Amino acid sequence: RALKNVTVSFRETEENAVWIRIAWGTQYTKPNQYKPTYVVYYSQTPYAFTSSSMLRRNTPLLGQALTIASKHHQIVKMDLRSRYLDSLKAIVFKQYNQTFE
């Protein structure tokens, strides 16, 4: 509805995590194939792992579109970033930090 050329592709993984590719086309061209944008969502958490796109003008559009479809009312961009996705799910979800009995 918002843009006329948005490529949406889904993939379901282990423990029900949806992996979303968005290719941004503006008004004319077939969309941005060389520079994609990835959204990691674990289907029950209110926390999401989104990659940095090179088009910064569509970043309020990508945030509120995840808010309506997952039944929430407020999106807050929290300021934390790293290059390892397996370590960013260890420091936030706090299930990997302590392994003792």
Binding site: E15, N16, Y42, S43, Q44, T45, P46, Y47, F93, K94, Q95, N97, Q98, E101
Partner: protein
Amino acid sequence: QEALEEKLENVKAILQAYHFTGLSGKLTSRGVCVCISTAFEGNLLDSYFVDLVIQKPLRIHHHSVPVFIPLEEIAAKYLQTNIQHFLFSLCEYLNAYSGRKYQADRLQSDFAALLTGPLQRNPLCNLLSFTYKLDPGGQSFPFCARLLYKDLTATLPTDVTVTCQGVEVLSTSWEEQRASHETLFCTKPLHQVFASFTR
């Protein structure tokens, strides 16, 4: 020495039994860590550890409970005015969490040959969807059942909507069957009603 080692093993028999009553834990310099073991219909599983500090105010450090259920709004309400009410509520949340995962493991192990098509499962299991087939009189009836839950602290369903994917222009047998599935999904658990389907 034999009197103290007999009294040491009497402590070790009671501390073995504290895992068998649901909540066990030892004291630490960094607060106290309580393991919670859950079970459903005489079948138990692994325990999850929750660390809780002694100092004021009560803060959370780490937990092996997943974050699929929101633990932030429970710890802002129940942890402040009480201590043992917060631990016994989360023992009932995780028994409802492992009670829904026990019904998902049985459905993919034994009774996956009765269902046709793919399955769509959420990890909270608040809304289930599966399509099965039965032979009551020699004709295959594709029954699509959607199981929506209204109480998050329970195991038994409340909202049962059972539809049919195939034909529906028949006699009064399928209306008596759809009235039979809606009564046997509310008052019977899901592992016992699948064993009654083979009966």
